[PDB]
Design a protein around this ligand. Structure first.
Ligand SMILES: Cn1cc(C(=O)NCCCNC(=O)c2ccc(F)cc2)ccc1=O
Length: 103
């Protein structure tokens, strides 16, 4: 239980974060030119939320894997000085920050 409760806390704080807007819903490939070709395994906060409520997380490790997948995708597709890039850096630093002050 207590392993996924802090996953609920982390995901809640990330969902309500100021810099969270580029990762709340899945990237719409019809809108983002080149995203389908470059990102082979897309991930966002809503998909992690769905899988968390539906229970499909065996441990905190798969959850953390999905978050790091969000930010790996962000850094793969967007420049570090793009708006999505800067947001993604703030969100990644926030996630590792809060994740480390539990484990
Ligand atoms: C995680 N992540 C998020 C985004 C992102 O959120 N991008 C803005 C949202 C798209 N929404 C639009 O409305 C739109 C799209 C294209 C256009 F030409 C005009 C408007 C992009 C790359 C990425 O890796």
């Amino acid at each position: 239980h207590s392993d996924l409760t802090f996953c609920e806390i982390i995901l809640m704080e990330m969902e309500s974060h100021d810099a969270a807007w580029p990762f709340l819903e899945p990237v719409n490939p019809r809108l983002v030119s080149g995203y389908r070709r470059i990102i082979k395994n897309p991930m966002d906060f809503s998909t992690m939320r769905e899988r968390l409520l539906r229970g499909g997380y065996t441990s905190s490790e798969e959850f953390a894997a999905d978050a790091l997948l969000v930010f790996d995708n962000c850094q793969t597709f967007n420049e570090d000085d793009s708006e999505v890039g800067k947001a993604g850096h703030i969100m990644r630093r926030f996630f590792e920050s809060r994740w480390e002050e539990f484990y």
